[PDB]
Every structure is written in C-alpha cells, then in structure tokens.
C-alpha cells in the first residue's frame, strides 16, 4: 500500500482584509465669521510641550526593546533555520543510509 | 504496510479569533473656550505625545510578541532537539 | 550496552553542563538531563 | 530496538529538563523499555 501526503497537506486559505479609512468630516459650517459677540481675546506666548519629543523617546525606548529582541529572534531564527538545515542534511542522511 | 508508516494528518485544525480589538474613537469638544475664544494659550499643546504613545504601543507590540518569539523558537529548538534525536534515532533504527 | 553506557555518561555530563550553561540561559531558559540507555 | 526504545525514553528524560531549558520541548520521561 503506497503512502500519499495528500491528507498531510491542508488548504492554507488567504483571508484578505479590505480596510477603507473613514473620511475627514468636521464642522466646515463653523467660522462663517469668527464671532465678535465675544471676540478672540488671544493669550499668546509659547515654548510648550514638546512632551511629544519625550514620547517619541518612549517610542524609541520600546524600540530599543524591539531592536534587542529582533536581535534575539534572529538567533532563534538561526536555530529554526539550523533545524531546517539539520532536516535538509538528515532527510538526505536517512535516504543515504536506507540506500547505501 | 507502506502507507500508515507516514501518519499523514492535518494537525492544522486550530482557529484563533482576532475579536476584541475595539478602537475607542476620542471625541474631544474641538472648540476653544465658549464662542470663538476668550482664551487661547491654555488648550493643552500635547496630543502628538498621545500619538507618539500610539507608536510606543506599536513598538511595544513589536517587542512583546518577539519577547514571545525568541520564546516560541527557544521552545521550537527544544522540540527540534526532539526531532534531532528522532532523526539520529531513525538512522540508528534503520542501521 | 556500553555504547549505551557512553550515551548514559554523556547524559550525566550534559546535565552537569546544562544546569550551568543552559542553566544561566535559565534567567531566559533552565536545566535537566537524566540517565540510562542500557540494553 | 529496545536500546532505541529506552534511548528515546531517556532523551524524554532529557526533554523535561530541555522543556525547562528554554520553556520549550515538552515530550518527557516516556518510552520506557525493560
């Protein structure tokens, strides 16, 4: 009785996720004029957060954790690619031993 | 018995749900104090911090899953140790 | 039995190594090889 | 054969400790020959 891989091989189905982002709707009927019934009493001065650059460095903190673990996942992909080379040689080695 | 000696079965029968991803739409008032305003300076220039924290939680998930992918592949090299002994033991049991 | 005694001695020596090297990989990882293959 | 049965079993007695050795290969203690 012959072997067949046809029941070892499933269908790897590709689901496609068609994202369409939401259109930019906001109050375009505002500012027909700016009101003067209370006018723009406009408090200036500046030099303000800039907490966005510290938060780009909390992004870059958790990017240091992702760089150091993409470096470790690269050793763990070396192991899973050395498995793939160990199997490449050993499925030849079982076939050479089951033939020589 | 040339067929059963390669137990050809799809162990691919698991089905993980991606459900539970509920993105909360922030709905700030987006109008300054009262009518067109009587103050301007105090409106909290910040929120590119909250979008840089949205990229902190991008890079945190690129971290966290790969703190969990060194992981699954340390577990895989310990399973592949079992495959290395299963192969060396298969050459042994042919020999 | 003595090829399997060399395999058994390697299993103990590989434990003494594993509980220290893969057993400092421990603080990422952990230990044990055992004994036997005698036939 | 019985050597490979116990060496598979005692590679399983390595593999509880190798499951411990990266949080990893489970297949433990079991193929025991006598």
């Amino acid at each position: 009785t012959y072997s067949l891989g046809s029941a070892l091989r499933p269908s790897t189905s590709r689901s496609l996720y068609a994202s369409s982002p939401g259109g930019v709707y906001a109050t375009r009927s505002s500012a027909v004029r700016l009101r003067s019934s209370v006018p723009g009493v406009r408090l200036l001065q500046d030099s303000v957060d800039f907490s966005l650059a510290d938060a780009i460095n909390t992004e870059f903190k958790n990017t240091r954790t992702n760089e150091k673990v993409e470096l470790q996942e690269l050793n763990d992909r070396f192991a899973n690619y050395i498995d793939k080379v160990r199997f490449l040689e050993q499925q030849n080695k079982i076939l050479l031993a089951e033939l020589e | 018995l040339g067929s059963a000696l390669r137990p050809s079965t799809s162990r691919s029968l698991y089905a993980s749900s991606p459900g539970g991803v509920y993105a909360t739409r922030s709905s700030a008032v987006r109008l300054r104090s009262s009518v067109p305003g009587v103050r301007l300076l105090q409106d909290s220039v910040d929120f590119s911090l909250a979008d840089a924290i949205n990229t902190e939680f991008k890079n945190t998930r690129t971290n966290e899953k790969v703190e969990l992918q060194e992981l699954n592949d340390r577990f895989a090299n310990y399973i592949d140790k079992v495959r290395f002994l299963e192969q060396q033991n298969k050459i042994l049991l042919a020999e | 039995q003595d090829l399997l005694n060399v395999k058994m001695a390697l299993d103990i020596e590989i434990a003494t190594y594993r509980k220290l090297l893969e057993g400092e990989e421990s603080r990422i990882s952990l230990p044990l090889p055992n004994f036997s293959s005698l036939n | 054969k019985m050597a490979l049965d116990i060496e598979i079993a005692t590679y399983r007695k390595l593999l509880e400790g190798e499951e411990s050795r990266i949080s990893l290969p489970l297949p433990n203690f079991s193929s025991l020959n006598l």
Binding site: - | N77 | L3, K7, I14, Y17, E25 | -
Partner: peptide, 15 residues
C-alpha cells in the same frame, strides 16, 4: 556503533 549513536543524546541548544 549503534550504541554510540544511542549515547549521542547528550549536548545543549545551539546558538
């Protein structure tokens, strides 16, 4: 020889 192949079971995780 088959006993040497049975004892090689033995060693640690690579890289």
């Amino acid at each position: 020889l088959q006993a040497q192949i049975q004892e090689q079971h033995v060693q640690i995780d690579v890289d």
